[PDB]
């Protein structure tokens, strides 16, 4: 605290250790609400220096369901109106209905999450990634563990449904070397009978494709 | 409601015996007394008729999927979470669209995947294109060199 109009930033306290009472509690790390304590016992300046927060979770860590990212039900000590009674109360976070679209499982999915999760989802690139880079005891949800499983399947199904495109392109490539000439349409049966990729399915499928050449023009 | 015998026999010989040439037992003929149930009774005994799809593969294409480098992991269906309990207590909860809700998902086995925006799909199609590029070395032989350059960096030291 200094009184000049324009106090340009500087390395150290320009005018000695900052004077005032509230500067006395900031010089020791406490917050400026220590100025309103009537007793500042060695436990008090421990209690209010936030060494370890007096703040807990509504349900057990194991039974927790709604995704509370990094929150507790912190109690806020209020001082009442005209006659200053001091009372305290437990303030919760705001849980929104998280109705997201996790494109891993190509469908909306709902998990109720605190506002802070609805931000850290978007900071993580998607809803699913926020489920996936968090880990067990960190993402202490239960719904988050039911939707991580579907996320872990419906990912390892994409990877599986990918290698299809590498076992299919292998066939498609290696069979083209036997669809080389249109000499015999009795032979196009035999090459198809070779890879057991029947004609009646393929013929019209290519037909629908040349029609699709006409569906897309 | 096809209740009175005169009405049930007037429908059952015509639609389930006549049109479909199905024949219902006695104990099912009891509950087979509505347009809703007539439809289902058929739609079970005709669904139990389609020859079970025969997974038959040729040989010439078979040796392709064997020698092909990239193979499927293919065990994930079990990782899926189980919801086993009394069928009523399990289905009372789906009293409404409690289906996609609260970390559940009606997992229908999907055979093809949308490729647009699908992170986990582009997350590997590049990792694949990073595998075809690394694979290019071993084809030409710059891998063996760049690997034989380590041991000659790690020998004289």
């Amino acid at each position: 605290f200094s009184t000049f109009a324009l106090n340009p930033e500087t390395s150290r306290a320009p005018h000695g250790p900052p004077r005032g009472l509230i500067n006395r509690y900031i010089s020791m790390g406490l917050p400026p609400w220590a100025a309103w304590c009537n007793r500042v016992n060695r436990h008090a300046l421990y209690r209010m220096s936030d060494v370890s927060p007096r703040s807990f979770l509504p349900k057990a860590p194991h039974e927790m369901d709604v995704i509370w990212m990094n929150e507790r039900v912190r109690e806020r000590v209020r001082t009442s109106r005209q006659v200053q009674h001091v009372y305290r109360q437990l303030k919760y976070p705001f849980v929104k209905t998280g109705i997201h679209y996790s494109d891993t499982l190509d469908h909306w999915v709902q998990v109720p999450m605190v506002e802070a999760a609805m931000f850290e989802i978007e900071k993580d690139g998607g809803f699913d990634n926020f489920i996936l880079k968090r880990s067990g005891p960190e993402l202490r949800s239960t719904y988050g563990e039911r939707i991580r499983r579907h996320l872990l399947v419906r990912q390892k199904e994409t990877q599986k449904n990918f290698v299809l495109d590498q076992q299919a392109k292998a066939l498609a490539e290696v069979t083209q070397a036997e669809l080389m000439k249109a000499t015999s349409e009795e032979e196009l049966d035999a090459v198809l009978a070779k890879y057991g990729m029947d004609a009646e399915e393929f013929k019209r499928l290519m037909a629908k494709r040349v029609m699709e050449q006409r569906k897309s023009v | 409601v096809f209740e009175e015998e005169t009405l049930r026999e007037r429908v059952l010989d015509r639609v389930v015996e006549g049109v479909f040439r199905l024949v219902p037992t006695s104990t099912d003929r009891l509950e087979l007394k509505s347009v809703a149930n007539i439809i289902d009774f058929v739609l079970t005994h005709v669904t139990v008729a389609r020859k079970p799809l025969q997974h038959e593969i040729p040989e010439a294409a078979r040796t392709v999927m064997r020698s092909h480098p990239l193979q499927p992991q293919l065990g994930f269906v079990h990782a899926l979470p189980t919801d086993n309990r009394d069928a009523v207590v399990q289905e009372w909860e789906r009293m409404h669209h409690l289906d996609w809700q609260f970390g559940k998902a009606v997992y229908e086995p999907r055979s093809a995947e949308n490729e647009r925006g699908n992170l986990t799909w582009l997350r590997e199609v590049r990792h694949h294109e990073a595998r075809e590029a690394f694979q290019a070395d071993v084809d030409s032989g710059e891998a063996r060199r760049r690997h034989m350059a380590k041991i000659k960096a790690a020998a004289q030291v």
Binding site: D165, A170, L171, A172, T175, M197, L205 | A112
Partner: peptide
């Protein structure tokens, strides 16, 4: 059936 659809 996927190798079918490419062609």
């Amino acid at each position: 059936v996927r190798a079918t659809e490419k062609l």
